[PDB]
């Protein structure tokens, strides 16, 4: 029994080893508890909060995207307080514009022609905010019907024609100046050049400015001294020096104390004009000068810019977990549990 005293001491040491290792396992459980309820409560709550803010912003952006046309129409009618100067792309899309023109009361060929200038159709037309009921905006767009197209059209410019005999001046000046467009049974006359807009060879005329004139008025473009029509021409006794621009040129009337010359923009004066009426082409000069006032004959072409936006990049950099090293150690633990328990059944069932 020198052995049984020692064996008692030894089992007690063992029961102390289990009690101490147990107090360790209990503390390890308390640590996993604080980690488990940090994750359950503090961590998943914060991610769902971010999930909620994220879903908020996705909804906001989508609202702005899925209702763009609507939101633009509100912007435009607010900015002009109910009346759009033009038919914007948002008020009526190109598909809609072409289908409406495709139902206008005209011939197929005029529809074709209108279809060709639908930009002008948009600018000469307009939009009206009719009403806001609840969440709807009701408006009407008003489109021009161009029933007359491709008829002869021309524009008249003039300068003072002064003749002098013995100190006195006799000045005739046409007062016909402006746009003439031909029409069925008459010609329409638009007195100010601003009353008609040119887009290519086509001339877009505001109906309100038009005054119907007799076709015979075109005889003034052959012989001014025609007896068939009363050509509107005014007379004066004083010389007036001035510059009148044409599409393709200019009329200059140089009289009395003025220095009229034709020049270029890079180098200077190239030719002095005589006193009287000079007609110059867009290809003869770039400038007509009266004393110190210089007139441009053509549009002066300037710089040419090119700008590209800054690039947009993605910021997605996901996260994962190094699972292999961990998951193998925990598998090991479940075996260290099962090996030891099987060993204590051995030990305990060795007692026979």
């Amino acid at each position: 029994e020198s052995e049984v005293n020692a064996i008692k001491g030894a089992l007690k040491t063992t029961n102390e080893a289990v009690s101490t290792l147990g107090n360790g396992v209990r503390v390890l459980a308390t640590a996993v508890r604080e980690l488990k309820e940090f994750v359950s409560k503090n961590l998943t709550s914060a991610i769902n909060k971010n999930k909620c803010d994220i879903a908020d912003l996705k909804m906001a952006v989508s609202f702005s995207q899925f209702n763009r046309r609507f939101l633009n129409v509100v912007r435009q009618f607010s900015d002009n307080a109910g009346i759009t100067p033009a038919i914007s792309l948002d008020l009526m899309t190109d598909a809609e514009l072409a289908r409406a023109v495709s139902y206008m009361p005209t011939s197929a060929g005029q529809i074709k022609l209108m279809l060709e200038n639908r930009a002008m159709v948009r600018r000469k037309g307009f939009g009206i905010l009719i009403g806001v009921y609840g969440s709807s905006v009701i408006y009407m767009v008003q489109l021009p019907i161009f029933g007359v197209i491709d008829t002869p059209c021309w524009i008249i410019k003039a300068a003072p024609s002064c003749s002098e005999k013995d100190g006195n001046y006799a000045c005739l000046l046409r007062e016909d100046q402006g746009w003439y467009c031909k029409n069925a049974g008459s010609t329409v006359y638009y007195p100010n050049e601003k009353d008609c807009e040119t887009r290519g060879d086509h001339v877009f005329c505001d109906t309100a400015a038009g005054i119907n004139v007799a076709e015979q008025s075109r005889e003034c473009n052959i012989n001014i001294s025609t007896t068939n029509y009363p050509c509107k021409v005014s007379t004066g006794r004083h010389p007036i020096s001035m510059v009148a621009l044409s599409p393709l040129g200019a009329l200059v009337a140089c009289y009395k104390g003025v220095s009229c010359s034709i020049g270029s923009n890079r180098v200077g004066i190239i030719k002095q004009l005589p006193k009287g009426c000079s007609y110059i082409t867009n290809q003869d000069a770039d400038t007509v000068t009266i004393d110190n006032t210089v007139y441009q004959l053509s549009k002066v072409e300037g710089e040419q810019h090119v700008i590209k936006g800054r690039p947009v990049s993605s910021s997605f950099d996901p996260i994962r977990f190094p699972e292999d090293q961990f998951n193998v150690a925990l598998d090991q633990v479940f075996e260290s549990i099962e090996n030891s328990q099987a060993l204590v059944d051995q030990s305990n069932k060795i007692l026979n």
């Binding site: 906001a60 905010l129 709807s136 008003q142 019907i145 300068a159 005329c205 012989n223 009329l251």
Partner: protein, 70 residues
Amino acid sequence: LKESYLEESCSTITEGYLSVLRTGWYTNVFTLEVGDVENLTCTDGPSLIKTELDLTKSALRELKTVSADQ
């Protein structure tokens, strides 16, 4: 085009233009509606989508004062 100088009247005729004259008016009526939006009840207080509707609701409430019907 062709621009001719008339020395007798100190004038210019420029021909070759082609006409586009308005002869009447054709009108379409449009009705635009806002899409439906779900109630986002998970934010605390001020949600951003609720405020975008209350912004566009007031923009429409104001835009009404200039409707033609009135």
